């Protein structure tokens, strides 16, 4: 006798599956994110941003700007050595 | 006004680079500089879960990190071999100090009302040492007052003092001949190296004050 027609009716495999929750995030997460940014390091532009451009970049953990700030505080209180004498 | 204003306003702008010109507009990938703050992060999220774990220990995570980065950066700035004294200013240190101990007090009686007394008893031991057993218990409580402060006041103070005695020494050494010049650098070589001590202990020092202000706030929070 004639082959039953439940298997012509889906809703429940294309809504009954798990990665239909992974589908609807990364049809938002991917499609809404640009492929590529502005720029990295531009904090303080006033050629300040050349500052962290060379020294607080991710590109290097150089002991430049320590070196640099350091040497800021060792001009502060000596200065004010010469200022005190 | 002062001098010691001046260098206040250097730790505060210190500490905003650091959340502000190390990051690059933060990246998930992470930054080199932004890597190191990860680590301060986790190791006194790990600490003061650690110490101050019970229902809470986040409510009381930025007051632990701001009296963390505040010794961490001050113990580096106050050993630049010309910046004036903020924490060498033991007053300062030692008054955050007694704040600190008070606003625990208080805490811990407001919190726990007069049952905060019993923190001052300390186990249950035979009954006629038991009174005795608060006496020496809250000497010991008030003795948590000045420990912490003068802990860190001693080290940096000693640090600073002992290089520039040495320093005056070997200024001395090499004022005199040239042959006193020679044999005026092994001690100078004994400078350096107590000066690498110094930095050393400055941040063990800072781990220290913030966790025994960790299990202060362990014994105010959670009674006995």
């Given at each position: 006798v004639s082959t039953l027609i439940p298997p012509k009716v889906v809703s429940s495999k294309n809504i009954g599956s798990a990665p239909n929750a992974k589908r609807i995030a990364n049809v938002v997460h991917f499609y809404k994110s640009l492929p590529q940014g502005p720029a990295p390091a531009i904090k303080a532009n006033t050629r300040l941003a050349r500052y962290k451009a060379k020294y607080f970049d991710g590109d290097n953990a150089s002991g430049k700007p320590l070196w640099h700030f350091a040497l800021g505080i060792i001009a502060f209180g000596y200065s004010m050595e010469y200022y005190f004498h | 006004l002062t001098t010691f204003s001046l260098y206040t306003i250097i730790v505060l702008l210190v500490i905003t680079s650091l959340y502000t010109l190390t990051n690059n507009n933060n990246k998930i990938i992470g930054?080199?500089?932004?890597?190191?703050?990860?680590?301060?992060?986790?190791?006194?999220?790990?600490?003061?879960?650690?110490?101050?774990?019970?229902?809470?220990?986040?409510?009381?995570?930025?007051?632990?990190?701001?009296?963390?980065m505040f010794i961490f950066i001050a113990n580096l700035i106050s050993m630049i071999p010309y910046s004036f004294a903020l924490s060498a200013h033991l007053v300062f240190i030692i008054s955050l100090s007694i704040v600190i101990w008070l606003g625990n007090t208080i805490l811990g009686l407001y919190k726990h009302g007069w049952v905060f007394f019993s923190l001052f008893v300390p186990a249950g031991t035979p009954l006629p040492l038991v009174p005795l057993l608060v006496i020496i218990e809250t000497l010991s409580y008030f003795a948590r007052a000045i420990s912490l402060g003068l802990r860190l006041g001693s080290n940096i103070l000693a640090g600073h003092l002992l290089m520039v005695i040495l320093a005056g020494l070997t200024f001395n050494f090499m004022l005199i001949?040239?042959?006193?010049?020679?044999?005026?650098?092994?001690?100078?070589?004994?400078?350096?190296?107590?000066?690498?001590?110094?930095?050393?202990?400055?941040?063990?020092?800072?781990?220290?004050?913030?966790?025994?202000?960790?299990?202060?706030?362990?014994?105010a929070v959670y009674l006995h």
């Open positions: - | 930054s080199r500089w932004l890597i190191s703050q990860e680590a301060i992060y986790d190791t006194i999220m790990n600490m003061t879960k650690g110490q101050i774990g019970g229902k809470n220990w986040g409510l009381y995570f930025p007051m632990i990190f701001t009296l963390f001949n040239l042959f006193t010049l020679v044999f005026g650098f092994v001690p100078l070589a004994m400078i350096l190296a107590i000066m690498m001590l110094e930095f050393a202990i400055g941040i063990i020092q800072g781990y220290v004050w913030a966790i025994l202000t960790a299990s202060y706030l362990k014994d």
